[PDB]
Amino acid sequence: GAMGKPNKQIKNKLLDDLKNLIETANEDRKKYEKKLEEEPSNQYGISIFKEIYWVASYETVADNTDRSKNYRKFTYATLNPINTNKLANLSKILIQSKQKTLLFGTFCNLGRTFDTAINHLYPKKDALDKLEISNLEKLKNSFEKLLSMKSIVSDMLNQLLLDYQDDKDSIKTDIAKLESHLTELYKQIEKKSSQATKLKNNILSISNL
Ligand SMILES: *SC[C@H](NC(=O)CC[C@H](N)C(=O)O)C(=O)NCC(=O)O
């Protein structure tokens, strides 16, 4: 009979959902790691890296230092889905950002938050059955939401290319409108980035395996 609810099954769908998000996150990671390993001398034409200095330093985010290579890697994590040959156009647009140091900082932060999450979870992708079912669900939701945040930001940056292309809202022919459009875009991205930190901490706090 007689209209039943089942736990072991609810758990299995969450586990399978998790092993799939983790696998797909990991491919994303292998792709941005490769994007750094195979970085051209001109860094895909992202010339903005050469104008972003570490806090009390002449060293740029372009330089050949571990911290500078990670910065660029975490940036590539955020720019990962955009075709590598459009990055120079994206860069040329962002040069006109009033906040490019902050904007590139959120790129990096997003990529790093993501990388920290998949780095934590990847090795545990068969130990997740150890979790209480309820924070398995919280884990699954937080991680799915975190991947989603990163996608939305890559979509927004890809959309900026097309809107510039098409002069959406005069951004291509009126520099003042581009600037305030880039400013709004920074606010939005910064927000996703804060949200991403939260989610990452959620994930870490309840998956101490
Ligand atoms: S992405 C992680 C760390 N830095 C940043 O995200 C801030 C970048 C700037 N605020 C900016 O360009 O706007 C990072 O690189 N950590 C490594 C370290 O050595 O601290």
CA of 43 to the centre of ligand 1 (A): 18
Place of tokens 């706090």: 205
Which residues form the domain of 82?
1-209
51 Cβ closer than 6 Å to some ligand 1 atom? no
The residue contributing the CA closest to ligand 1 atom 11 is 105
Question: Which residue CA neighbors atom 14 of ligand 1 most closely?
Answer: 71
Beta strands in 1-120 (DSSP E): none
Query: CA–CA separation, 117 vs 22, rounded Å?
Result: 9
Dist. CA 49–CA 43, nearest whole Å: 8
Q: Which residue, 121, 99, 123, 112, is CA-closest to 72?
A: 112
Beta-bridge mates of residue 60: 53
CA nearest ligand 1 atom 5, residue = 105
**How many domains is the chain partitioned into structurally?**
1
Q: What is the secondary structure of 64-75 as a DSSP string?
A: SSHHHHHHHHHH
Centre of ligand 1 to C-alpha 198, Å, is 17
Q: Is the CB of 112 under 6 A from ligand 1?
A: yes
Q: Is 108 annotated as a binding residue?
A: yes
In this structure, the number of other CB atoms found within 10 A of the CB of residue 141 comes to 15
Contact 94, 44 (CB under 8 A): no
Distance in angstroms (rounded) separating the CA atoms of residues 116 and 64: 22
Q: After which residues is the chain broken (C to N over 2.5 A)?
A: 5
CB 14 within 8 A of CB 137: yes
Ligand 1 contacts CB of residue 44 (under 6 A): no
Q: What is the 3-state secondary structure (H, E, C) of 160-207?
A: HHHHHHCCHHHCCCCHHHHHHHHHHHHHHHHHHHHHHHHHHHHHHHHC
Nearest CA to ligand 1 atom 18: 67
Give the Cα separation of 149 and 127 in Å (integer): 25
Distance of CA 76 to the CA centre of its chain: 8
Contacts of 40 (CB under 8 A, 6+ apart): none
Asked if 165 and 90 touch (Cβ cutoff 8 Å), the reply is: no
Output the CA 104–ligand 1 centroid distance in Å.
9
* Tokens 């989603």, located at residue: 148
Cα 109 to Cα 193: distance, rounded to the nearest angstrom: 7
Tokens of 57: 């330093």
Question: Is 71 labelled a binding residue?
Answer: yes
